[PDB]
Every structure is written in C-alpha cells, then in structure tokens.
Amino acid sequence: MEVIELNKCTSGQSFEVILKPPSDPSLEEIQKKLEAAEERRKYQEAELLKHLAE
Amino acid sequence: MYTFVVRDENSSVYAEVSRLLLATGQWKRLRKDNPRFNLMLGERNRLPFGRLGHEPGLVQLVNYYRGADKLCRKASLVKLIKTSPELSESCTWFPESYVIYPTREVFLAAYNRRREGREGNVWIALISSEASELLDFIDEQGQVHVIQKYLEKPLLLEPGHRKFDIRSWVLVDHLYNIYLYREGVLRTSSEPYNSANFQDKTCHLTNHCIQKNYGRYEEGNEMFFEEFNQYLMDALNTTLENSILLQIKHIIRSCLMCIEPAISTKHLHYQSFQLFGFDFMVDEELKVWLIEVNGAPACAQKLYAELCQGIVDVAISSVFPLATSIFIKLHH
Amino acid sequence: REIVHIQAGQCGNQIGAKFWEVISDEHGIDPTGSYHGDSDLQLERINVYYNEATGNKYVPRAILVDLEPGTMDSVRSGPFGQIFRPDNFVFGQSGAGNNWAKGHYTEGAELVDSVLDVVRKESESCDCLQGFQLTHSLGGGTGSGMGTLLISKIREEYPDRIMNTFSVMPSPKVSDTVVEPYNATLSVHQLVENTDETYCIDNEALYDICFRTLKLTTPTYGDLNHLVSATMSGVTTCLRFPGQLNADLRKLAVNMVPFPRLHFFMPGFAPLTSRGSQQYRALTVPELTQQMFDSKNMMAACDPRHGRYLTVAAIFRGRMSMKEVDEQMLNVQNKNSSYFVEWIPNNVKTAVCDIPPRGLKMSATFIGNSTAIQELFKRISEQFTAMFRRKAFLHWYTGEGMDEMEFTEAESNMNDLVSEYQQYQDA
Amino acid sequence: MRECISIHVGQAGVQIGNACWELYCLEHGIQPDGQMPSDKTIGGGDDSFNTFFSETGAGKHVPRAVFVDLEPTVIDEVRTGTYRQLFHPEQLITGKEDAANNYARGHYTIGKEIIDLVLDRIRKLADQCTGLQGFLVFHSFGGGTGSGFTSLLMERLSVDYGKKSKLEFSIYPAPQVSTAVVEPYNSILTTHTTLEHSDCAFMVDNEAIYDICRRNLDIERPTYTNLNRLISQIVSSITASLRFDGALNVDLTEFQTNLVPYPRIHFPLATYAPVISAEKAYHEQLSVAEITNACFEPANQMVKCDPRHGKYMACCLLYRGDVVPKDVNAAIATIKTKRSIQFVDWCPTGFKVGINYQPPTVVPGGDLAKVQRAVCMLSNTTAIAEAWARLDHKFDLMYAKRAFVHWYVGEGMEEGEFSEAREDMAALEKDYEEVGV
Ligand SMILES: Nc1nc2c(ncn2[C@@H]2O[C@H](COP(=O)(O)OP(=O)(O)OP(=O)(O)O)[C@@H](O)[C@H]2O)c(=O)[nH]1
Ligand SMILES: Nc1ncnc2c1ncn2[C@@H]1O[C@H](COP(=O)(O)OP(=O)(O)CP(=O)(O)O)[C@@H](O)[C@H]1O
Ligand SMILES: Nc1nc2c(ncn2[C@@H]2O[C@H](COP(=O)(O)OP(=O)(O)O)[C@@H](O)[C@H]2O)c(=O)[nH]1
Ligand SMILES: CNc1nc(N2CCCc3cc(OC)ccc32)c2cc(F)ccc2n1
Ligand SMILES: [Ca+2]
Ligand SMILES: [Mg+2]
Ligand SMILES: [Mg+2]
C-alpha cells in the first residue's frame, strides 16, 4: 500500500495512496436557435389572434 | 393491505406465491408497471434494482438479490471460488473447473498431469475423454463454456445401478438468515450407469427434463428424503443427515457467507430475499459435491404447497405482518 | 402578482359577493375597507386580490357586471356592499332573459366594451398581473353568454395572461328554465377554448350535498353558495397566504393540465358544514383525508371511481402535523393507486397553511383533474339533445341571430371533449 | 492566486448560496458586514480566501457571488437578510415573472430577455479577477429557472470564457420536497443542453438529504433550512481546498483531473460522515475509521445507489478535523478487505486524500453538532447512473402520452428537443454501463 506525493503545511496535509495500478456552439448559433423559438412563438400567437378575429 | 406486482409470469414458484398472497385478503396485486407496490416478484433478466426503494411511504421488498448471479452463473461460479480467500483453490467440494472462451488457460496443464498417471480424464461442458474432443465443442457454440472434472465413480442406488443429484432449496431473507428447506429431492436416472459410452448421455445427465424409462423404480425419477434416508440406513448403515446433509449445510453456508458483503440489503433503501436451488453430487465415498447453483429454481410438484407457504411466512410476512418450521436455519 | 376578479350575472355576482365576504373576513378587512386583524400573514399577500387605497384602505380588485340592475343593487346593499369600488359596477338594463344569445351577441355586445374599460383600468394598476378569475353560471344568459364574450375578448387583449373561471353547472334539481342545457353547451364550447382553468361547480352536487349530507330538506341558493364560498376560499388559500409553495395561477395550470382542453377541475371540501350550526369536534387528519376524497364531498356530481385522476392538488388548513398530513396523503394513493394514472408520476401534491377558515379548526380543500368529469358533460349533453333533436325552444335563439349550425358545432365540440376524457381514462 | 465566481440560479440555487456563503463567513471569520479582523492585508491580498472574496478599500470582504432569479421573492430575502451588507446590489438580479416550472419558458421566453443583463454583471466580477479560474454554478434540475435559464447561461459562458472551468452543484428532484410534476422533463432537458458545458457536476438528490435529516438529525419533516445547511456543509468540504492552504484540489482544473477521466461521465458521487444531531446530549466521537467506513454506507450518500454494483474511476477523501495520514491508511487497509470496491481496469485502485486540520464549522443554533473530525468522500462510481435511469423512466412514462408537452411547445420549443435530450440520456446511460461491467 504505497503512499506518495505527501505535501504538508500549517493547515493540514494531503497525499495519495495506491492499492494497485491499472490493468462548443457559436454566439450566433445560440442567437439563431433562441430567435427561431421566438418566431415560433409569434406565429402561434398570430394564429390565435387570427382565429379570434374570425 | 399490502400491494404487490408480478413481472415474471413464468415463475412456477411465485405463481403460487401470488395466489397465496391474494387469498390472505390482505394482499392486492397491482399492474406490472405500477410503482406503488410493497413487493416486486420481479423478472429474471434486467430486473430494475435501481428503481427500488424510492417510493416515499413505501417499504419495498423484492424476491431477488442483486449480485446473486455471481453464484448462479456457471462461468462466474468458478471465478468466484478460485478468487475468494473464503473458498480458495483448496476447495474440497467443488470439482476442478476452468473457463474457456471460443475464438485452455491453465486447463491443458492439468489434463497433462493426468497423462502422468493415466487417471480418469472424463470432463463435461458435452462429456468427452479427449481434450480435443471437448475443446472443439465450445467453439461450435461460440459462447463461453466451462469444463469440469467428471465424477467417474459416483454413488449408485440399487436396485438399478443408477445416478442421481440432490436439489436443496435455500431461502435467504431480508435479514440474511439462511433457511434450508427440510424437503429435498433426489433427481434419479432410470438408466443403469456405465462409463463406457458417454455419448449415450441419458444415464449420465440426471435432469428431470432430459428424461423425456421415466417412472420405473420411483415416480417421476424423483426420490424424496424419507425414502433415500431409509435406503441409506438399510444399504449403508448410515443416515442422510450424517453422511450427506452436514456437508450440504456446510456448502450452502460457505457459498452464501462468501457473497454476503456484495449482496446484503441490511442498510439499503430496498430489501431483497431470494430462493436458491442448490444442486449436489454424492460420490461413492459418501462425499458431497457442489455442481450448480440455480437462482431461478423450480420446486418439486409435491412440495410446492409447503415451500411456497414458507416463502410467505419467512421472507414476505416477516416484513409485512398480518392480523414447527419447514426450514433449517444455517447459523453464522 | 395581482389577480383581476370579474363576476357576471345573477349567479356570478351572488357567489362573487360571498367570496369577498369570506376572504375579507380571513384577511381581517371589514366592510369599511379597514384592516383589523391579528397576524401579519393576513397582510403579506393582500395585494393579490386587493388594491391598497389612500388612508391605508383595501379595495377589492373586482369588476361587477350584469345586464340587469337587480342583483347588482343587491350586492351594493349587502354586508360588504360598500367595499366594492363604485366605478366597477358596470351594468345594462334590458336584462338577458336566460338567453345565451342575448348575452353573447346582442344585449351583451352593447355593454362589453364598457366592461373591458374597467378591466383595462385595473390591469394598468398592476405590478405583475397573473391573470383573471371570473364567476358565472353557465345556465342563465348574462354570466353564461356575456361571461364567455368577455373571456373571448380578454384573451384577445391579454393573450398570455391566465384565464381562471368558477363555472356553476346547471341542474334539473335546481333550474330556473328549460333552456339551461342549451346555454351551458354553448358556454362549455367557449370554456374549452379560452380558459386555462375552470372549477366545475355543479348545482347538482351542491343540491345533493345540501339534501343528503347536510340534511337540509329544502335548500336555497344561500345554502348552495355557502358550499361555494368554502370551496372558493380553499382553492385560493395558496394564492392569498405565504407558504413553502408560493403558488400562482400559471404554475397551477402547468401542473394540473397535461393536455390543454382537459382543464375542468372537480373541487371538494372537508368537512361539509351547514350554515349557522357549528359542530365542535375538530377532525383528525385521517378524517380530513378520507372525507376530501369522498365522492360525497365533490362539488361536481361525478363518481371518481368511474374515472382516473390525471392530477390532484390538496390544501390543508389549520394547526396539524405535516408529518401526519404526509402519511395520510401517501396512504390514500398507495391504497387506491388504481385510480391515479400511472403515466404521470407523483401526480398528487399537497400544501398546508396555518390559518384555518372562519369557524373550523381544520379543513381540507381538494382540486381533482379526474377523467370522471366527463360524467358531467355527458349529462348536459343528454339534456341538450333531448330538446335539440326536436329543435325545441330554438326560436328564442334564432330570433337573436343564431343559426342551428352554431348549436351543432357546440354540441359536437362537447361530445369531442368527452371523447378526449375517455381516451386517458383507459391509457 | 486565481479567483472563483459563484453563480446561484433560481430558488434552489439562491437559497443554497445563502446557506454556503454564511458558512464560508463563519469559517473564514468574516462578519455579516463583510469585515474580517484577521485580514491584515487590507483592501487586498492574494491569500487563498481571496479566491472567493474580493476586499474593498474600506476593508470589506465581498463574495465573488452573483445571484439570479427570474422572480423577486427569494433574492429579496438576501436583500434584507443578515448578510445584506455582504453583497453589492448589482450582484442580485431579479425578474418579475418566473419560469412557472417550465424549462422552455426559462430558457427561451424569459431567458432570452435577461441573459445579456446577467452576463454583464458576471463580466463586472471577471474584471476584478487577475486570473479567473471559472465558475461554480448552483441550481436545481427541477425549477424552470433552475433548469432552463442555467443551461442558457452555461452555453454562453462556454462562449465568453472558453478557457475557464465550469462546475455544477445540482439539486436532483425528489417528490418528498418536490414542487412540480414536470420536474423530470426539466431535468433531462437541462442535462442534455448543459452536459458539454460543465466540467464537473455534483448531484445532490433531495431524497437523500431528506432522509439524512430524519434518521440522523431526528427532524420529523425537514425544511429547506434543514436541508440547505446540511447541503452547504458538503459544499464547503468540496470547496475548502480552493479557500484554504493545501496541495489537493487547489484549482477547478484539478477536480476534472482527479475525478473525471472521461468528459461525459463527470458526476462524482458525494458521501459525507458523520451527521450528528445537536440535540443528542451524550455523543461518542467517531474515529477516523468509523467515519471513513461510513463513506461506503449508501445511507450517507448524496444520491442513494449501490456502488458495489458499479466500478470506480477515481476517489478522493476530504477530511476536516483531528486526522493524521496514518489513521487514514489504517482505516483504508481494513476497509479494502471488507468492502466491494472495484475499479475500472484502466484506473489505479487508490485514494487521493486531503486533510484540513480545522474541524468542521457549524452555524450557531443549527441542527448539526460540532465534531472532532469529519470526512467527505468524492467517488466517481458508475452506480450513480441509477439516478439517470430513475429520471429517464419517469420521463418515458409521461412523454409516451406527451402529457404536458404543449406547455413547452407553446413557449417556442419543438416536440423534437424532447427526443433529442432523451436520446442523449440514452447515450449517457450506455457509456456508464459499458464502463462498469
Ligand atoms: N436542497 C434544496 N432544494 C431546493 C431548494 N429550493 C428549491 N429546491 C428544489 O428545486 C426544485 C425546483 O427548482 P426551483 O429552484 O425551486 O425553481 P426555480 O429555480 O426558482 O425556477 P422557477 O420555476 O422560475 O421558480 C424543487 O424540486 C425543490 O426540491 C432549496 O432551498 N434547497
Ligand atoms: N463434475 C461432474 N461429474 C459428474 N456428473 C456431473 C458433473 N457435473 C454435472 N454432472 C451431471 O451432469 C449434469 C450436467 O448438466 P447440468 O448440471 O449443467 O444441468 P443443470 O444442472 O444446469 C439443469 P438445472 O439448471 O435445472 O439444475 C448435472 O446435472 C449432473 O447430473
Ligand atoms: N349555486 C348557485 N346557483 C345559482 C345561483 N343563482 C343562479 N344559479 C344558477 O344559475 C342558473 C341561472 O343563471 P343566472 O346567473 O341566474 O342568469 P344570469 O343573471 O343571466 O346570468 C340557474 O341554473 C341556477 O341554478 C346561486 O346563488 N347559487
Ligand atoms: C395557486 N393554486 C395552487 N397551486 C398549486 N400548485 C402550484 C405549484 C406546483 C403544483 C404542482 C401540482 O402537481 C399536481 C399541483 C398544484 C401545484 C397547489 C398545489 C397544492 F398541492 C395545493 C394547492 C395548490 N394551489
Ligand atoms: Ca489580504
Ligand atoms: Mg335566474
Ligand atoms: Mg423561483
């Protein structure tokens, strides 16, 4: 059971212990998606204001 | 009124368990995918253990032990016995076993040691005498197989010169008590045993099914415990308890005590019990051997009533109570 | 989050007035508009329903609408009459004659813009308007026909605000006229399209509850409206008082309404109490739970065992163990888990408020979205076609512009709604 | 010295942030006014607590915190609470209308209207940072703000700070404290859209915290104050290495290194012992070995699962209190024999350990007793995928009827983002299952 890289200091100490070894989208792309949804909203709202107008 | 669901319709055993539960008037059965169950009589493969014990205000109990397959899977059972110090290679009740995949690990080095004394070199998967005969049989299936020392000198019942195995039904409860059913079954071969023609594997393979002579000396190729013990007394001057049952109780205890840390539901959010069928092989020296552990075991027709009524008393009503014993507690 | 309240017609204004009486008592406001209460919980969310006047007075955010002056003069006379803002009495004179067409198309049309003006004034005051709640019956003519005209127009001006109604369903056991199934089917068509949440207050239930359970031999509208104030106070507790939930109309709609047309809720109350006579044993939390889920306590005459609960909201009032409330609520589901859809996990939510209602130490209001509400629409649809297959009494409507076709459409949209409720009672 | 900016989002995030920053203040001896008598470097310092506090010319110590809720109720109590003086008003951002438990309302509708305002106030702190490390982001899986605004924020931060690290503290939804029936939709939607923008995520299942509060704190019905104060103890354990002298987990980059080998699998299970009631009059102090053994009881995990049926990829032990290395290795020794600790073949079976001698700090009057030593294990075990499977099942149950879908489509979203976010989770569950058999 091998201890290693033990660092000490006034606050405490740390170390590691082995038991065994081995064996992003663009701002503009965000702006697109985010603005497609707002359009999809405004369509659905206009269809409602069109139905109410009928 | 407790609630339970049923997700393995192929369970001869718990088919009964469901029926008995309803007939108590205090157990209603929900639908498969209804999560507000107290008790899951679950499915055999891919039972969803990750989803259990998350229903607030529901104590949940399932009839299987996650991890239990490490014992009930032939390849894994060998791996378990070789590697656990609790069992060790110096395991005196498991026959020699190697796991060989189809595309010899240290299997060949043992077979050769057998060329040194020309000792018995019969094995199984399926039974051969030449390694090449067998090894060429696992690659014709393509799946992992396991080969074992065949027990060339077994114990034969007379009249018949016949083979047989012993199935003990063990029930482990939510507390990890180990309960052995007092009723056992000898699954007997009606064909007189002989070691010249292995390929005529009807007197070698003792499976109740594979015996599609069925019914000669005892009904259904099954001899219960009262009969066998009688014959033992008369024929060998011994009892079932002493010559055989001790070692079985030793093997059951040892196997289940091994995996207890991996499968115990003591401090877990859901709980498990499970019924196992343990399969043994008695040789001519009255020595018991462990063949296979069966995690999804069927009971013998005559004992269903009693065994399933005991699952409910010991494993189910223990957790969910309502308004001498048929088990032997294996102590630890 | 301000709410704007609207009461329309005979029924709408009589239950409207009780509501303001009942909750004005709970918030410690008196008829003069002055607060005289003990706790501060009473004032924390007082703005949801009341505008704060100078002199630190509290004026309900309520618009009063009728086509006749009758009831509206009544309200101004009643105990809390003076609390209501006088410019918010908006009325005509000709009445509506229990005629959906007169309310929606002829008589109501004249007056509606005047109503929309008061609405707009109140909306402008509002820091963040949640939406509107309306009280009306579906069987008369003002609250029914004009009521749904207002809703159609309000949705045009405020298409993204929440529309909540308390809609009293007609019943032969308590009916003014034979044409109520006509007026209700035309209204339900409107409600299915233009409201987020409607509480189906069935006059059939209020009658049976008054007759059978409260043993009232000859129930008046005042006995029925008692039951309606109690429910209305319950289903708005979580809006008027601080909680762990901080609930509002939109969140309520999100969580109650899996599908948009299935927004008709079964209300329930426990304990059922008759006016005046007070009984003296508080209920055990186990009793509140069994009673509130009892069909005998439902305010929509539907058997909950004939359908499945899509979602449930329950609200407990008084000093009691939330631990026990938890156990009792979990208890009823796991016991009757059959009657709750499996395909909406954890569809029963619960809330608690320390303050009980006047004259009870412990109470439970219940909001169910059960697929059994179809039983209600089926009832009204049967009555409707009993008459329509003979075009009986239709002249009252054709005479005001309406076409047989409009009747066939409404009927058909309703029978559709029943089909939709049946789709999921099986799923 | 490198700075760390904490961003708390929605109700769960903001209330937990109060919890934590109060604790941080007791632990660092900062007062409700932001004064820290111990700081002699007045108006500055590149001390290690300055990773979480800037100092003012007047000697005030100010959280590198920003709070963001789409609705004023919750942050308003921060604005009028014991630690008002602590924060700069610009740090407390408030909407007027909340996401109504709606992932898509908080992401698309109301999100798009506040994302730029928030990022500017975030940039106002990044401009006081000599070498900014990155972000600690606190939020619920369940709320509409919690889930939907957080992922819009996470996306942008990847764009405006592509070189800084992003860590997550995420409240996973539990019906005993839940506030909404659609929380499984919001959970999946936000995990799919945030997965590639978070380097390391610590899930805390409200179910687990609730049961610890009942079993070990003898609290009948835990409140958010009960849950959050216990939750910030764990958070403190996990961050103390950034705020204290040490050699283990000194920067947000070390958390990925030590705990996350494969990028997607970045959900380290947290286990924490001991939780001891402040009411218990006579308590027997637990040993290094008793508490280290407690780290392998599920009943102590932040997520209830079974690490036995799973494989480890990494593992840290964070001790606070009277602990020396020898007692740890002795405890480790005897634990490695009695427990089912299986590592993936391609990872050294081992334990990176860190000890801080200052024992755990408990807020005066809370529910936690003071203790001589405590520990928080961080293990990246595949058993945590159990939590993914549970959520994904509830999601499948509802979505197969498309129940509630319309609330989302009605805000701009497309029925298709539902099957896209869910297919991703299908991937995640599969990555975990390969890695662990
Ligand atoms: N542990 C803990 N969990 C919380 C807390 N507050 C809320 N939650 C959880 O967060 C989930 C809902 O997310 P919220 O943060 O409340 O919603 P939100 O972020 O304010 O977004 P909105 O929908 O706009 O309100 C619920 O399931 C709660 O269990 C808290 O203070 N502590
Ligand atoms: N090492 C050995 N020596 C001799 N005979 C053996 C043996 N191992 C097994 N046998 C016999 O041969 C049979 C081999 O088949 P096997 O044991 O795989 O069937 P099975 O036990 O899996 C059916 P079940 O699952 O229903 O119990 C054993 O049942 C036993 O009868
Ligand atoms: N519960 C209850 N129902 C009422 C009340 N007043 C009227 N109704 C019902 O409402 C229907 C009549 O509609 P009404 O509101 O009076 O006509 P309107 O004035 O034109 O809106 C009848 O079916 C009544 O049963 C009341 O005070 N309480
Ligand atoms: C404003 N009225 C209101 N709203 C509630 N909410 C909003 C917030 C989450 C929520 C989730 C639901 O899942 C089914 C149901 C209901 C609710 C509510 C909840 C109650 F348990 C009791 C009374 C309630 N009353
Ligand atoms: Ca300094
Ligand atoms: Mg009338
Ligand atoms: Mg909020």
Instruction: Write down the architecture of domain D269-383 according to CATH.
Output: 2-Layer Sandwich (3.30)
Q: Hunting for tokens 């009928």 — which residue is that?
A: A54
Are residues B15 and B164 both part of a single domain? no
Chain C touches chain D, with at least 3 Cβ pairs below 8 Å, answer yes
Atom of ligand 1 nearest to the CA of D10: 19
Q: Are B154 and B195 in contact (CB under 8 A)?
A: no
Count of C-beta atoms within a 10 Å radius of residue B294? 16
The chain D residue lying nearest A42, using CA atoms, is D412
Q: Where are the domains of chain D?
A: 1-268, 269-383, 384-437
Beta bridge mates, C199 = C166, C265
Experimental determination approach used: X-ray
Q: Is residue B220 part of a domain?
A: yes
Query: Count of domains in chain B?
Result: 2
* Residue C381: closest CA among C419, C334, C351: C419
**Number of CB pairs < 8 Å for A and C?**
9
Q: Are C150 and C115 in contact (CB under 8 A)?
A: yes
Structure tokens at C273: 């109490």
R_g (Cα) of chain D, nearest Å: 21
Q: Hunting for tokens 């910030």 — which residue is that?
A: D232
Q: How far is CA C207 from CA B39, C213, C232, C384, D196, in A?
A: 44, 10, 17, 21, 60
Atom of ligand 1 nearest to the CA of D146: 19
Are residues B44 and B169 both part of a single domain? no
Of B18, B42, B62, which residue constitutes the final position of a domain? B62
Say if residue B113 is exposed, middle or buried (CB neighbours under 10 Å; 0-12, 13-18, 19+).
Answer: exposed
As a whole number of angstroms, the distance between CA C105 and CA D408 comes to: 35
Q: Are D422 and D212 in contact (CB under 8 A)?
A: no
Structure tokens at D107: 């992401």
Beta bridge mates, C59 = C51
| Helix ranges, chain B (H) | 12-22, 69-72, 74-83, 107-117, 131-138, 225-231, 240, 246-263, 304-311
Q: What CATH number is attached to the domain comprising B51?
A: 3.40.50.11480
The chain B residue lying nearest D296, using CA atoms, is B267
Longest CA pairwise span in chain D (Å): 63
D149 alpha carbon, distance to own chain's centre: 17
Q: Is residue B112 part of a domain?
A: no
C126: amino acid identity, one letter: C
**Structural domain for B38, as ranges:** 2-62
As a whole number of angstroms, the distance between CA B132 and CA B119 comes to: 17
Count of C-beta atoms within a 10 Å radius of residue B323? 5
DSSP label of B192: P
Question: Ligand 4 mean position to C252 CA, how many Å?
Answer: 5
Count of C-beta atoms within a 10 Å radius of residue B236? 11
As a whole number of angstroms, the distance between CA B193 and CA C161 comes to: 87
As a whole number of angstroms, the distance between CA B4 and CA B32 comes to: 9
Ligand nearest to the CA of D107: 1
End-to-end CA distance of chain D: 42
- Helix D385-399 × helix D183-194 angle, to 10°: 120
Of B44, B62, B80, which residue constitutes the final position of a domain? B62
Structure tokens at B122: 């019969």
As a whole number of angstroms, the distance between CA B252 and CA B279 comes to: 10
Residues 6+ apart with CB under 8 A from C253: C162, C196, C197, C263
DSSP string, D82-146: TTTTTS-GGGEEE-SS--TT-HHIIIIITGGGTHHHHHHHHHHHHTT-SSEEEEEEEEESSSHII
As a whole number of angstroms, the distance between CA D18 and CA D24 comes to: 10
Looking at ligand 1, which residue's alpha carbon is closest to its atom 28?
D178
Q: Are A24 and D159 in contact (CB under 8 A)?
A: yes
* Residue B1: closest CA among B29, B20, B33: B29
Taken in order D47, D49, D52, D58, the sign of the CA dihedral is negative
Upper half-sphere CA count for residue B199 (Cβ side, 13 Å): 3
Q: Are C14 and C225 in contact (CB under 8 A)?
A: yes
Question: Ligand 3 mean position to D211 CA, how many Å?
Answer: 51
Superfamily of domain D1-268: Tubulin/FtsZ, GTPase domain (3.40.50.1440)
- Tell me if residue C282 falls in helix, strand or coil: coil
As a whole number of angstroms, the distance between CA C258 and CA C243 comes to: 25
Chain B residues with CB inside 8 Å of D389's CB? 48, 50-51
Q: Are B52 and B71 in contact (CB under 8 A)?
A: no
Q: Is residue B48 part of a domain?
A: yes
Which contiguous run of DSSP H or E holds residue C58? Answer: strand C57-60
Q: How far is CA D342 from CA A22, C360, D138, D437, in A?
A: 12, 60, 31, 10
Q: Is residue B204 part of a domain?
A: yes
Check if C427 contacts B (Cβ < 8 Å).
no
DSSP string, C314-357: EEEEES--HHHHHHHHHHHHHHSGGGB-TTSTT-EEEEEESPPP
Residues 6+ apart with CB under 8 A from B196: none
Q: What CATH number is attached to the domain comprising B208?
A: 3.30.470.20
Longest CA pairwise span in chain C (Å): 61
**Number of CB pairs < 8 Å for A and D?**
112
DSSP label of C99: -
Residue C156 distance to chain A (closest CA, Å): 7
The chain A residue lying nearest C153, using CA atoms, is A52
Atom of ligand 3 nearest to the CA of C201: 1
Nearest by CB to residue B268, choosing from D175, D298, D339, is D298
Q: Is residue B138 part of a domain?
A: no
Structure tokens at D267: 């959900």
Ligand nearest to the CA of D49: 5
As a whole number of angstroms, the distance between CA D40 and CA D26 comes to: 18
D278: amino acid identity, one letter: A
Structure tokens at B330: 């294996």
Does the annotation mark D254 as catalytic? yes
Q: Are B177 and B329 in contact (CB under 8 A)?
A: yes
Q: How far is CA D115 from CA B120, D171, D176, D414, in A?
A: 80, 22, 32, 21
As a whole number of angstroms, the distance between CA C200 and CA C49 comes to: 22
- Tell me if residue B310 falls in helix, strand or coil: helix
Of B40, B62, B84, which residue constitutes the final position of a domain? B62
DSSP label of C83: G
Q: Are D80 and D71 in contact (CB under 8 A)?
A: no
As a whole number of angstroms, the distance between CA C225 and CA C204 comes to: 13
Strand order of the β-sheet with A12-20 is A2-8, A12-20, D349-356, D312-321, D373-381, D269-273
As a whole number of angstroms, the distance between CA B166 and CA B18 comes to: 27
Strand order of the β-sheet with D65-69 is D92-94, D65-69, D3-9, D132-140, D165-172, D200-205
Residue-range domains of chain C with CATH: 1-258 (3.40.50.1440), 259-372 (3.30.1330.20), 373-427 (1.10.287.600)
Residues 6+ apart with CB under 8 A from B155: B164, B282, B283, B284, B286
Upper half-sphere CA count for residue C86 (Cβ side, 13 Å): 2
Chain A residues with CB inside 8 Å of D192's CB? none
Q: Is residue B259 part of a domain?
A: yes
Q: Hunting for tokens 């609520």 — which residue is that?
A: C329
Residues 6+ apart with CB under 8 A from D43: D55, D56, D57, D58, D59
Are residues B37 and B162 both part of a single domain? no
Q: Hunting for tokens 């309703």 — which residue is that?
A: C414
Q: Is residue B83 part of a domain?
A: no
Beta bridge mates, B282 = B288
Q: How far is CA C144 from CA B9, B63, C67, C99, C174, in A?
A: 55, 59, 11, 8, 16
Are residues B55 and B163 both part of a single domain? no
D20: amino acid identity, one letter: C
Ligand 2 and B187: CB distance under 6 A: no
Atom of ligand 1 nearest to the CA of D227: 1
Chain D residues with CB inside 8 Å of B262's CB? 308, 340
Annotated binding site of D: 10-12, 15, 71, 99, 140, 143-146, 179, 183, 206, 224, 228, 252
Beta bridge mates, D381 = D312
Peptide bond into B159 cis (omega under 30): yes
Looking at ligand 3, which residue's alpha carbon is closest to its atom 14?
C140
Structure tokens at D63: 């959280």
As a whole number of angstroms, the distance between CA D269 and CA D302 comes to: 7
Question: Ligand 2 mean position to B227 CA, how many Å?
Answer: 23
Structure tokens at D135: 């972000």
B310: amino acid identity, one letter: G
Residues 6+ apart with CB under 8 A from B45: none
As a whole number of angstroms, the distance between CA D66 and CA D9 comes to: 9
- Tell me if residue C272 falls in helix, strand or coil: coil
As a whole number of angstroms, the distance between CA B60 and CA B68 comes to: 18
D239 alpha carbon, distance to own chain's centre: 10
As a whole number of angstroms, the distance between CA B13 and CA B301 comes to: 10
As a whole number of angstroms, the distance between CA B42 and CA B32 comes to: 9
Q: Are D248 and D354 in contact (CB under 8 A)?
A: yes
Structure tokens at C183: 């007026």
Residue D211 distance to chain B (closest CA, Å): 10
Longest CA pairwise span in chain A (Å): 81
Q: How far is CA A47 from CA C19, C156, D135, D426, in A?
A: 36, 12, 42, 36
Q: How far is CA A19 from CA D280, D333, D379, in A?
A: 38, 9, 16
- Tell me if residue C63 falls in helix, strand or coil: strand
CATH number belonging to domain D384-437: 1.10.287.600
Count of C-beta atoms within a 10 Å radius of residue D421? 21
DSSP label of C303: -
DSSP string, D7-56: EEEHHHHHHHHHHHHHHHHHHHT--TTSB-TT--STT----SGGGTEEE-
As a whole number of angstroms, the distance between CA C288 and CA C290 comes to: 6
Q: Give the resolution in Å.
A: 2.7
Subunits close to C (at least 3 CB pairs below 8 A): A, B, D
Strand order of the β-sheet with C197-202 is C89-91, C62-66, C2-8, C129-137, C162-169, C197-202, C264-270, C362-370, C309-318, C348-353
Taken in order C167, C171, C173, C177, the sign of the CA dihedral is positive
As a whole number of angstroms, the distance between CA D386 and CA B202 comes to: 46
Residue A49 distance to chain C (closest CA, Å): 7
SS (H, E, C) chain A: CEEEEEEECCCEEEEEEEEECCCCCCHHHHHHHHHHHHHHHHHHHHHHHHHHHC
Count of C-beta atoms within a 10 Å radius of residue B321? 9
Check if C276 contacts A (Cβ < 8 Å).
no
Residues 6+ apart with CB under 8 A from C260: D406
Q: Cα angle at B115 between B112 and B117, to 5 degrees?
A: 125
As a whole number of angstroms, the distance between CA D190 and CA C157 comes to: 33
Chain D residues with CB inside 8 Å of C258's CB? 401, 403-404
Q: Are D41 and D171 in contact (CB under 8 A)?
A: no
* Residue C308: closest CA among B147, D195, B34, B245: B34
Query: Out of D3, D22, D207, D254, which one is annotated catalytic?
Result: D254
Subunits close to A (at least 3 CB pairs below 8 A): C, D
* Residue C149: closest CA among C335, C9, C252: C9
Ligand nearest to the CA of C179: 3
Residue C154 distance to chain A (closest CA, Å): 11
Taken in order C194, C197, C198, C200, the sign of the CA dihedral is positive
Check if C413 contacts A (Cβ < 8 Å).
no
DSSP label of D336: H
Looking at ligand 4, which residue's alpha carbon is closest to its atom 19?
C313
Are residues B312 and B167 both part of a single domain? yes
Q: How far is CA D329 from CA B272, C49, C144, C261, C326, in A?
A: 33, 64, 79, 64, 44
